[PDB]
Each structure stands twice: as structure tokens, then as C-alpha cells.
Amino acid sequence: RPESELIRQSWRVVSRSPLEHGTVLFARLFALEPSLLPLFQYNGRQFSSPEDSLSSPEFLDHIRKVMLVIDAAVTNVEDLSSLEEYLTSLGRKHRAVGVRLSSFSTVGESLLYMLEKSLGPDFTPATRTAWSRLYGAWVQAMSRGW
Ligand code: HEM
After folding, report:
1. Is residue 87 a contact partner of residue 141, using CB atoms and an 8 Å limit?
2. Among the four 6, 45, 109, 118, which has the fewest Cβ within 10 Å?
3. For ligand 1, which residues put their CB under 6 angstroms from it?
4. Could you tell me which residue ranges the Globin domain spans?
């Protein structure tokens, strides 16, 4: 797993404090597409601003949830044949709550953004590329899906 090690190596850094990094991801996501903000509704209430979501334990718990899943996807980076059916299932939950396949690009770009900011110089071209491949493989899975 030559291209896998890069993923585990890069991830171990962000895996240490999942909320902080997952916070950066969604801050970024909401900064790029604020139209995704109302998809996260808790207590029958809509977040007015992106920062409102940051004060929601429900929403923070969601971030952890997402961070845990990617970290799982990182565990299985070598085969990718184990997580397949969970992803189609996860993608199934996403279609259900009314997310669009076209937002995947935005989440991926937010994920890559978060990784770049965290790693700095360590976020090598090879590392960027492997993550793009990796994220691509999840989206395809989650898209099988719709
Ligand atoms: C394509 C853009 C995406 C959008 C707009 C989106 C939006 C959402 C929303 C609105 C929820 C509902 C959570 C809640 O109701 O509290 C959710 C759940 C979730 N998301 Fe995302 N999502 C996207 C892609 C992804 C990707 C690529 C992953 C990880 C590979 C992911 C991981 C998760 C997980 C693990 C959950 C909760 C699963 C569950 O509750 O069963 N999402 N997403």
C-alpha cells in the first residue's frame, strides 16, 4: 500500500483531534456552499448562520460521526472492498434526506482544504492526489448509491 501509507500518515495528525479538524471542514463547507446549512436541522430549527451550527451539540456530534467514518475509511484504505456496502448504505441515507450528488465535489474540496491547512508542507502533491483518488472511491460507492 504505497499510496495508502500516505493516507494513513497524513490522517494520523487530524485523527488526534477529530472535532477541531472536522470543525474546519464544515466551516469551510458552509463558507463555500451556505445553501447546505439548512440540511442540518435539529429541534425543528434551522441555523441562521454557519456559526450557529458550531454551537449545536447535535451538529458537533455529527462532525465526530463523519470524522469517525472517514477514519474508518482510512483503516480500510488497502482493500476498499469491506466498506463498499456501508458506503452505498450511507449514500442511501444521503439521498434520503435530500442531498444532491453534486455536493460531493464541495465536501471533497472541503475535506482536501482541511487536510491542506492541517498538514502544511507535509501535504505533498502525492498526498493531495491519493486523497483525491480515495475520496473519489467513496463518492462512487455512496453513489451506488442513488
Ligand atoms: C455530498 C455532500 C454531502 C452532503 C450535502 C451531506 C449532508 C449530510 C446531512 C444533511 C446529513 C444529516 C445528518 C443529520 O441529520 O444530523 C449527513 C449525514 C452523514 N454524513 Fe454527510 N453529506 C455529504 C457527503 C458525505 C460524505 C462524502 C461522507 C463520508 C464519506 C458523509 C458522512 C456522513 C455520515 C457518516 C452521516 C450520518 C450517517 C447516519 O446518520 O446514518 N457525508 N450528511
Report:
1. yes
2. 45
3. 36, 39-40, 62, 65-66, 69-70, 90, 93-94, 97, 99, 103-104, 107, 138, 142
4. 1-146
